[PDB]
């Protein structure tokens, strides 16, 4: 429930006041589903190890691992706050010599990120440097 | 100038692989008796399915490299393995058998069938010193003559492998199963009316769980499966490569009425401490062979719909042939399936006997007043011992079921196999029944779904400075 | 003082000592062979983790993101067993507060997160 | 007006269920001897118990639907199954036995007891080709007359149930166990002096872990168990219903001195590659029946202690009756327990033959002139083969123990069953020893504890705006 | 990558520059390597209860436990922010009567952290009480 | 005045224990050698190892209570047990054997060796009434004389316990393994040129993964191991305690060329459904005994090196003695190892026959023109059945390998045993080959590494107020 419908929507149009509210609603729904799963299973004690029991345990471990990964990254470079977060690194236009308005009105998130993957390494490394910078400025 | 800005939770995913779990809501769990292997494990299904419709998306699909197929394939295999593992081992019953004909040569109602054999044999009891000469009943398909002797016989797979009987309490009636992904992943569904199995898809939807599959394994014809829409749809990895199989999905169900008209007694003999082999006591009344009832008109109409689409595939100017199966092991050569824990083997020769003329069809069988020779009766037989389809060994005996047995199900799909040869100018493309693969039955059901991992972190250059 | 020592005392005093409970639920024989109690302990610790991270997630999703204390914007409805302040603070306990705020607590939770989304929309 | 204010870590808990793990202390791990029970699996117990007393709390308790009693029972059964799973299988030894009286007719010191039987038999050796006629000593309880005659015998369970002997290296000496919850849960302890098992409780404490239980399975009696303080407490699910079992807790220990006065030899015979059945070699010296020593005045003091509390329960004007169970299974009918890996069956008829009267009661035995007929001596016997109490299958064998066996334990509680009949105006309430249930032994141990989940998140209005 | 090489250098000299620069190299690089390993492992699959699968499963479970525990510790006393955190608790000179110059430019971390292995519990509990007082004020 | 200030990520480790996992590069997986007792379960090793130099730390080490030794010990034990657990059971073959000379009395080329025995025997197959008189081949080491008639024989391990043959598809070639810790821990490496095994260390380096070990177990010798630097190094818990073993690390590799000059045929006989015992068909050509080729001068010079370090250890004025082992089980008494899936047992005499005098050494044999009696030939023999070293049960049979077998490896280390006696004024310290321990082989590898947990959080007063 609350899965984003902005997958077809153009990244920029979708990002402004169309996807931010849904993103947090989606997180709340997944949290409610996880709570429902953990309470029913505890009441049933049907979690005794068997092939299905191993398959569901692994899936839960993977899920928590993945979420913790995301939150871990998100915190460790200074965005402990909310989904949207600015940063200090100037965006070297060389990465994609393209203008903002056209990209926002025409490009979508999936096709956007797949031609950025080359420079994603560079931008993230520059970000960690900006964190270091501001921490040795304070 | 710009500074990158990040957005957690952007609509981005990536084709990936992961583990899945099942869901059997609560109807199976309510009975809490004769628990099936799937029932006591699956997590209750969420009452409200969520199917978010996606727009402006042309994601590519290819079912022949779908990871979830193989995963669920080894899932079902391991589940059966552990489900049957702890119960009885049947290795000591492999001796010589002294057998008569049926109950008696006194037959009214088919004659000498040979399907009971009243086999006698010497066996060791639970006490090591004690030994007893006991008798039991067996079908022709469950015993091989040995020693070139009319009286001598042995089980089929003694000199090959081992056997462990099915464990009597557990039921063999399938139930719907819903595969559900853990968080951070989603399943994409191609909702288009027609899809050949590989390519971009216009109608795309996002779900967290699949619809119930109700796993059924059959040879030649799909059962209790899903239906196509507005027409029959064919899927092949490479139509020019005749070596690969053909997948057929029908747009109407076909009712099939199979039964085992015999009153049976479950006589139980002990061969060990906990070892209690279950055999047939006797038969009350005449021995009528098991059979399936099928309508004629409906069959023609659906098979003719197949004919047109198959013609359309390989060029208009063709003549169609439906020869019977070439040969091999019993499953693929002759129609087989399961019903109430009894494995039926039906002789579907009369089912595939058709030669559509390039210029004789397009007229269905619209017989309104029928009231007669309208039922297609299938000669069906019983085998109690079944081995692993892929593994050479690992066999399993089927305990007899007391009383009368009858199922009625929904034929939803066929498995076809094109054979090349003198068909170039003859234009006589011949199709025979197929099977023997555990993956294809479910390939027929998983083509519409594919799994994607969800990567929510995204980056966007923006002129805002912190 | 103590894991459940505050219980008997009123909610206001419980708030002062609410940090000793926050240290509990930490959720942390290094080898775990598939024997008997070893796996029992593994399953138990794996559960505890979900419990914490569930509560943690709710906090972050709400306008709180920070532990021990967090204030809101939803007005309290009369309908939700409204009394005074000396009543709901200096007179009665957390344990039996749940008794009358139980079908309401779910209504209150849905209210707080809808307002939190609404304030984000306004910002 | 008010705005809700969130608070993490508040005293709300909730009735709940969860999984628990044991603690055996560092010393049990330090001995590291044969992993008795689950010495290694248990986590080292915390050095400092934490028992935060809770005041102003009236929490209700009910031990008859406490789930951890069921949890503990299943855990014990699983641990025993794991211990006996790799043990030597004993199925082949089930043959006919050719038995003499015990050893010899040269008895001095009790006469014809029949407890050794010097049974001989024909059995296959490790090598299939060689078969050797061997012997073994067996108690009268172990072998039933079979095929009638006089000289044919066989084990009690053969066709009925398989047997696997106890592995020799492991020991059965129980050790204290501490159940400990994972984080987010707590255990509540009702600390009141007298509790009838269900109702609100004044004195309450939250504890990190339960005290050592040292699980002991015994019938008609409770050994090595917790003692009620300052009173004797009688608990039952339904006092009105005679069928419901009655549990009596004691306020003093009673010392019991059981022994097996026989010098034994462990003769070991191979029946397979790793199969090494262990039997008794012989007996050095005279054969004396096992005998438990018990003081008179002390047991009587506790019989009077039961009486008073019992006639305070069912109305003053009653006459009390103590009768043994007329019909029961061998474990259920008479007293049985374990000692040094040897299961004793004692005849507790002299502990349950008392007719307390309404008048002349309340005077105790203050006998200062003792030094004599002051020991209740119990006729005790040995059974080596014991089967699952509940499941009709899965029996074990007890290997013999060399040398002398002696125990001295701590009698702390009773199980009694009320029987109804001609007791209305007679006022002759009759009570009989009970047992045969694995749960009840630990129902008394876990009565004061109960588990609760802890939910930290609470919400409360306050006028502070963000 | 980015491990601890400042142990030899006096606590103070490492604290002024090395701890700040290494912090991110210690928080991000280690986590990124773990994430890459998990992603390749999940795609490879073949995760059965074999002798090895159980070992690495427990390994990552321990890893997540230890990381989460540190975050709970920092979060409960107000270090929901990052590396550098002050406190309100005055350092009692009765615990350790040493001048700052000796503590910083003569002594390192391992030797010093061992010296407080009696006062440490008292210190932390006081930090919790001060945090509660700040909660009362705001 | 000061206020404490907290830091997250200070350089503080602590002595600790934890679990580790493996990393077998990709090369074994790139070859698909079908899971050689530890392949597909390992994670791919990181391309770029990170060995951070430590400065100004004198961390103490002691290898004799390093836990990872024991951990990896039991790891190897269970890893081997689970590989051979699912394949063939080899109990039924234990019968009497009727055996000839070798294959034939026609011997050219050594004479009466007795190493083939052409043993015949009656056995039972899958079908259990068709007894089969079959033959096979066995070595003199594999078969014991029971009944000292002439041609009456049995497999040595039928009194002890059970046998299960190695499962043919899996190979035995070891591959490098890298132990890697989970996050929050590190491994410290003592990089000093010479280390006695216990004490402070000057050169320290923190890695996260150990270098490949390539697990190899051998007795009296160390093979394809690691090398010392500039000198032979010598380690012992208590040198005075002559009871403890001595580990010797070498500074040069020594090439060893072992071979099995016999063309072999793998004749396969079924004894059950899936039970297919593999035995030797025959030998093509002459029977040349397996042997190992070793250079003289290298061995002499390296033995000189050890002697000098040993007369630095126990005082200069000594005379050195190299007597052969005392006795016992085959492994430690005479040299043994593995090669291409065949366990060789080489007679170690010519190696340890040396009495380097107090006044006769210090001249290495630098023989230039040799071209002759320069190769040390080792009489080596074959045993196919090998048991557990410590436990008495759990034995395996090694299937024969077809064709020619030949390995060439690098000797790198020694195990020795000081025997005391009349050596005080004689000064004739005697040392013999050792072995029989699974730990020591790896103690020789893991001496340099030790694990430490990392706790990042640290406190420090500072005058800054919040
Ligand atoms: C456990 O403790 C109990 C309590 O002490 C023991 O049982 C008690 O036994 C005494 C008798 O020893 C009994 O007292 C009798 O009570 C009866 C009713 O209250 C009275 O009828 C009786 O008076 C006399 O008559 C009885 C026959 O009707 C005689 O049996 C009894 O011995 C009395 O005999 C009188 O006359 C003779 C001869 O002149 C004289 O020697 C006697 O002293 C007496 O004057 C008694 O008052 C208690 O009622 C019993 N209590 C209970 C609870 O049963 C019991 O033995 C102890 N068990 C063990 C193992 O030690
Ligand atoms: C219980 O029954 C067993 C049989 O299962 C008896 O064992 C047998 O006892 C006889 C008599 O002592 C033994 O024969 C003797 O052997 C010695 C030594 O060679 C010889 O000197 C004597 O003349 C006599 O032949 C026999 O070996 C022995 N067998 C075994 C397997 O132990 C046993 O004596 C009985 N014990 C009692 C107390 O009744
Ligand atoms: C391996 O290395 C050792 C070390 O050199 C060789 O040992 C010995 O070498 C010396 C010098 O050749 C021999 O000394 C002889 O001493 C006797 C009495 O003192 C006398 O005849 C001469 O003075 C002579 O130099 C010595 O015999 C010899 N062995 C001893 C006992 O030390 C050894 O030869 C080398 N080779 C092999 C294959 O063993
Ligand atoms: C004989 O094996 C077994 C048979 C049955 N159950 C078992 N359970 C563990 C086993 C072992 O692991 C073992 O005892 N073994 C010895 C050490 N070993 C070697 O490689 C080796 C052998 C000889 C000389 C030097 C090294 C591995 C293995 C063969 C084991
Ligand atoms: C449990 O509740 C009682 C009743 O309020 C508390 O007893 C009062 O405590 C206050 C302050 O400690 C005293 O001023 C009163 O005189 C006490 N008695 C009363 C009000 O009757 C008690 O302290 C509480 N204990 C806990 C642990 O919560
Ligand atoms: C280890 O100790 C040595 C000796 O003090 C350090 O070497 C000196 O370090 C200081 C400051 O760290 C420099 O000013 C000197 O120039 C260095 N040279 C000398 C005199 O040896 C070394 O840096 C220390 N290593 C660490 C980083 O712990
Ligand atoms: C960005 O700049 C490069 C300079 O080489 C130019 O070639 C490219 O066309 C520019 N992008 C656009 C779309 O203007």
Numbering used by the authors:
A (entry chain D), E (entry chain B): 520 to 657
B (entry chain C), D (entry chain E), F (entry chain A): 33 to 140, 144 to 146, 150 to 309, 312 to 321, 321A, 322 to 395, 395A, 396 to 464, ...
C (entry chain F): 520 to 547, 563 to 657
Paper text:
The resulting mature Env, which consists of a gp120 exterior subunit and a gp41 transmembrane subunit in each of the three protomers, is incorporated into budding virions. During virus entry, gp120 engages the target cell receptors, CD4 and CCR5 (or CXCR4), and gp41 fuses the viral and cell membranes. Here, we present cryo-EM structures at near-atomic resolution of two cleaved full-length HIV-1 Env trimers purified from cell membranes in styrene-maleic acid lipid nanoparticles without antibodies or receptors. Cleaved and uncleaved Env trimers assumed remarkably consistent yet distinct asymmetric conformations, with one smaller and two larger opening angles.
Processing of the AD8 data likewise yielded two Env trimer conformations; only the major conformation (herein designated AD8) with higher resolution was refined to completion, with an average resolution of 4.1 Å. Aligning the gp120 subunits generated interprotomer Cα root mean square deviations (RMSDs) of 0.24–0.33 Å for the AD8 trimer and 0.78–0.82 Å for the AE2.1 trimer. The α9 helices in the three aligned protomers of the AD8 Env trimers exhibit rotations of up to 7.4°. By contrast, in the interprotomer interface with the smaller opening angle, HR1N forms a loop that is well resolved in the AE2.1 Env; in the AD8 Env, the density associated with this loop is weaker, likely indicating a higher level of dynamics. Alignment of the AD8 Env with the uncleaved HIV-1JR-FL Env(–) trimer again demonstrated similarities in the overall fold of the protomers, opening angles, and asymmetric topology. In the AD8 and AE2.1 maps, densities of approximately equal intensities corresponding to BMS-806 are evident in all three protomers. To evaluate the potential impact of the asymmetry observed in the AD8 and AE2 Env trimers on antibody binding, we docked several Env–antibody complex structures onto models of the asymmetric AD8 trimer and the symmetric HIV-1BG505 SOSIP trimer. For the AD8 Env, docking was performed on a protomer (Chain E) flanking a more open interface. In general, bNAbs were able to be docked onto both the AD8 and SOSIP trimers with no or minimal clashes, whereas poorly neutralizing antibodies (pNAbs) encountered severe clashes with the adjacent protomer.
